[PDB]
Amino acid sequence: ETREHLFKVLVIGELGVGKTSIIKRYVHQLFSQHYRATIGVDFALKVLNWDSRTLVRLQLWDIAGLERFGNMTRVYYKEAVGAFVVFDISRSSTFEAVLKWKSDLDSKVHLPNGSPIPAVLLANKCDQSQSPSQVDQFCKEHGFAGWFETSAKDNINIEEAARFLVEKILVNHQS
């Protein structure tokens, strides 16, 4: 009965937006307020008991904030099947930069069938433009599968956001 999957998932976004902390909360249920800046790429494995016929493992690639200015993202993205694209809900510079990351991603990697990999937008630090129709419009226009406000600090919506992205990866993996 049981089926096991291993998926490569990217976590990308500007310096200091929370990439590392969202992964540490989701995988280890821990949070530190102390900023330790990531160098290049860091990794985690999440093991998700999806349901009774399904075990999913995620290989989480934590891409550091500077890496879009370097020349290695094509290597980093290779064979990814999903992405979280993370900004800091308090700092608009980090929101403007999400399209730079999103365009980098869509230039460099696609699913085996040629489509864009699903990508979910995480507005992180929600604990610190609050808009229902606007979200939908933005995601449609820039090819995001959905959008969640998150807190790594208070553990808000990180689990739901992950399950949402995994759900899209599973449909694509069956298709």
Ligand X SMILES: Nc1nc2c(ncn2[C@@H]2O[C@H](COP(=O)(O)OP(=O)(O)OP(=O)(O)O)[C@@H](O)[C@H]2O)c(=O)[nH]1
Tell me the binding residues for Mg(2+): 20, 38, 62
94 binds, among Mg ion, ligand X, none (CB under 5 to 8 A by kind): none
The answer to whether 38 contacts ligand X (rule: CB under 6 A) is yes
CA distance 118 to 111: 9
Nearer to ligand X, 142 or 153 (CB): 153
Minimum distance, C-beta of residue 131 to Mg ion, in the bound complex (Å): 28
**HEC per residue, 95-158:** HHCHHHHHHHHHHHCECCCCCECCEEEEEECCCCCCCHHHHHHHHHHHCCCEEEEEECCCCECH
Binders of Mg ion among residues 1 to 20 (CB under 5 A) are 20
Pairing of strands 54-63, 3-13: parallel
* Binding footprint of Mg ion on the chain (CB under 5 A): 20, 38
* Binding footprint of ligand X on the chain (CB under 6 A): 13, 15-21, 32-33, 35, 37-38, 64-65, 124-125, 127-128, 151-153
